[PDB]
Design a protein around this ligand. Structure first.
Ligand SMILES: O=C(O)CNC(=O)C(=O)O
Ligand SMILES: O=C(O)CNC(=O)C(=O)O
Ligand SMILES: [Zn+2]
Ligand SMILES: [Zn+2]
Lengths: 22, 338, 338, 22
C-alpha cells in the first residue's frame, strides 16, 4: 500500500553507536 | 513552566532556583508530575503525551552513582565523549557528513577510558577552562560486574509492562549521559519512544509536540543534523524562521529518581542547570509500535512527519544525489502550490 | 520562428502570412522542415526532438477530406464537440472536477452527430456569432466504410517502422481534430509520443522542451487541468509566473501533408491560423518506450517531470485528500529547502 | 527499485475518450 509505505516510521536516535545491553 | 521548585525532604530547601534556568523567547506550560500509580499517568503515556513519573524506582540502584563509583566499577571500555567550546552540543550523524562538506561541527567526539574522562573534567575545573565535555555512551556487557548488578536491579517489571501495554517494539539501547553544568542538547526529535531516567543533578526539559514541525525547521533529512532544529534558541533568526515566533513548549525540571516519558517524534531541548554540578541520566529507547493495519484519516501530525521524511529519502535515492532534493521540491511548488 | 511562408505549387502564392499569427511575449526559433528520407530527420526523432516531415504520405487518403465528404461518409456515431465564447480551448479532465469544485470550465463538451456539427457551424457563420466550436473525437470502427478505407490507406509501413525503431509501445488512439479559424489549444504536454498529421488548413505549433517546466507552471496533478500551463499566454501574470519571462519556443506552421513529431513531455501550443478557414488534423498517439533497466545519471528533464508527477500522486493517496498536497509540500520546504 | 518506481511514466493525453481504431 502506498499510504502504508509512506507513513512507515524510521528508528533513528541521537546516538553514534547503538546496542542492547546483552 | 515547571512551576515552583520542589522542596527537598528533610527541610533541605529548594533543589534549584529560577536563576539556574536559561532565558528563551517562547512561553511554556508545565509537564504533569504524577505517580506511576495514577490513572492519569497511564492515560498520558497511552495517548503519547509527556508525563514525569516521580516514583517508578526505574533506576533505583543507579541513584548512588557518582564519578568515583563509576570510575571504580564501570570497567576499562571506551566511552564516547564530546568536547565543545560552546554550551550547545548539537548532535550530528557522522555518516552523513560526506553529503555536506561545508558542515563543520562545533563539538568533537573523542573515545577515552572513563578515568580519562574524569581526569579531563578535573583538569578543566582546576585551570578554569571554558571547554565543555558531554559523555554520551550506550551501556553494554563490557561494564564491570557491579554496574551489571545495578542494571539488573532496574525496575524491569514496571517498564516491561509499559512496553507490552503500549505495543512497543524492543528496547534498542540505554544511553548513559554525563554532562557538565550548563550543557545544552539543542532541540530535536527521536524516532523511538524514550523513558528518560534522571540519576544525578537536575535537567530542564522543554518539549514541543509533533504538530510544531512548522515552527522548528529541522535540517534536511540528508544533512548530518537530520532531526535537529535549525533555530538557534539563544538568537533566533525570525527572517529565516518566522514561525518560531509561534512556538509553545511544555517544560519540567527532572531530578534524581524522576522519569520523563518523551514520546516518539516529540521535540525536546534538554539543559543541565547552570551552577548545578554534573548531571547523570540513563535513557531507555524503544522502537515504536508498528504502523496500523487500517490507517485512519485524518492523519496524525507524527504520521505526516513520517511521510515528509520518506519523501525526502525517496527523492535523494531517485535523483542519485541528495543535493538535488531541494531544487526539485522548489520546482514542484513554485507558482503551483505556494 | 517558422521562417518565411512557403510558396504553394503552381504559383498560388504564400499559403499564409504574418498577420494571421497571434502575438506573444516570448521569442522562438524554427522547427526543422525535412524529408522523411533525410538522416537528420531520423536523428531528431531518435533524440526525442521535434521535426516537421514534409513527404511521409502518412494521411494521403485524408487530404481529400472536407466537411461535405466527412458528413456524407463518416457515419452516424456521436462526436465530442467543445463550445466556448473564447478562442482558448483549455483541456480539462472531467473526472478530476470533484477534487476542485471551484473550477468552472470556459468550454463545454456536447455530443452530437457529424451533420449536427456541420449545421451548428453553418448557423454560427450565417448569424455572425462569436461562439466557437472545436470537434475532438478519437476515430474507431463505427465510421462509415469509405473512412475505414481511407484509414487503411494511411502509410502504416512508414509509421510502423518508426514505432519499431524507437521501441515505442502500442498506438493507443487517433484523434480527429476539426477547428474553426482562430481556435487555440493552450500550452500543455502529453504523456505519449505524437505524430501530428495536418490535413486541411494551417496550424501554428509552438513547442517548449521538457526542461522549461520551471517557466510554464503546470496546474497541480490533481486539478482538472493537469499537464496544462497555468500561464495565460495573452496576458501573462509575471508576478505569479516570473520565469515565464525566460521561456523560449520552437515554432512552425504545418499545412496539408505535413507531419509534426511532438515528442512525449514536450509542451505544445497549437493555433488554427486567423482567417484561414477550418482546420483538420489527425494525430497518432503511441505509448512511450519502457523505463530503461539501468537508469543513467544525471537524469533527463523528462525523467524529473515523471518523478514530480509521481510524488504528487503518491502524496494525494497517502494524505487521503488531494487538497492537502500543497500544504504538506510547503511545510517540507519552508525554511528547510528554500 | 525506488528510482525505477518514481521515474515511471504515465500515459495521459488530452482526450476524454480513448480507443484504438479496431
Ligand atoms: O540528555 C540530553 O542531553 C539529550 N537526551 C536526549 O535527547 C534523549 O535522551 O533523547
Ligand atoms: O491540435 C490541437 O489543437 C491540440 N492537439 C494536441 O494537443 C495534440 O495533438 O497532442
Ligand atoms: Zn533525544
Ligand atoms: Zn497535445
Amino acid at each position: 500500500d502506498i499510504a502504508a509505505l509512506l507513513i512507515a516510521a524510521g528508528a533513528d536516535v541521537n546516538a553514534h553507536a547503538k546496542g542492547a545491553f546483552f | 513552566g515547571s512551576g515552583e521548585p520542589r522542596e527537598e525532604a528533610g527541610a533541605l530547601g529548594p533543589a534549584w532556583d529560577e536563576s539556574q534556568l536559561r532565558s528563551y523567547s517562547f512561553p511554556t506550560r508545565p509537564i504533569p508530575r504524577l505517580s506511576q500509580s495514577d490513572p492519569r499517568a497511564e492515560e498520558l503515556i497511552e495517548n503519547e503525551e509527556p508525563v514525569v513519573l516521580t516514583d517508578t524506582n526505574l533506576v533505583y540502584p543507579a541513584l548512588k552513582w557518582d564519578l568515583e563509583y563509576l570510575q571504580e566499577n564501570i570497567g576499562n571500555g571506551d566511552f564516547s565523549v564530546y568536547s565543545a567550546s560552546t554550551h550547545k552540543f548539537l548532535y550530528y550523524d557522522e555518516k552523513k557528513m560526506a553529503n555536506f562538506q561545508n558542515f563543520k561541527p562545533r563539538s568533537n567526539r573523542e573515545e577515552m577510558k572513563f578515568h580519562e574522562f574524569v581526569e579531563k573534567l578535573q583538569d578543566i575545573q582546576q585551570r578554569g577552562g571554558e571547554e565543555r565535555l558531554y559523555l554520551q555512551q550506550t551501556l553494554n556487557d563490557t561494564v564491570g560486574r557491579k554496574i551489571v548488578m545495578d542494571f539488573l536491579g532496574f525496575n524491569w517489571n514496571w517498564i516491561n509492562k509499559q512496553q507490552g501495554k503500549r505495543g512497543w517494539g524492543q528496547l534498542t539501547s540505554n544511553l548513559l549521559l554525563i554532562g557538565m553544568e550548563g550543557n545544552v542538547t539543542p532541540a530535536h526529535y527521536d524516532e523511538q519512544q524514550n523513558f528518560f531516567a534522571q540519576i544525578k543533578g537536575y535537567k530542564r526539559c522543554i518539549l514541543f509536540p509533533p504538530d510544531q514541525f512548522e515552527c522548528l525547521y529541522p535540517y534536511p533529512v540528508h544533512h548530518p543534523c537530520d532531526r535537529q532544529s535549525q533555530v538557534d534558541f539563544d538568537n533566533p533568526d525570525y527572517e529565516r524562521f518566522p514561525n518560531f515566533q509561534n512556538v509553545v513548549g511544555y517544560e519540567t525540571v527532572v531530578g534524581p529518581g524522576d522519569v520523563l516519558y518523551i514520546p516518539m517524534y516529540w521535540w525536546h531541548h534538554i539543559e543541565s542547570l547552570l551552577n548545578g554540578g554534573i548531571t547523570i541520566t540513563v535513557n531507555f529507547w524503544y522502537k515504536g509500535a508498528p504502523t496500523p493495519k487500517r490507517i485512519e484519516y485524518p492523519l496524525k501530525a507524527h504520521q505526516k512527519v513520517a511521510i515528509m521524511r520518506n519523501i525526502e529519502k525517496m527523492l535523494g535515492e531517485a535523483l542519485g544525489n541528495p543535493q538535488e532534493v531541494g531544487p526539485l521540491l522548489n520546482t514542484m511548488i513554485k507558482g503551483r502550490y505556494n
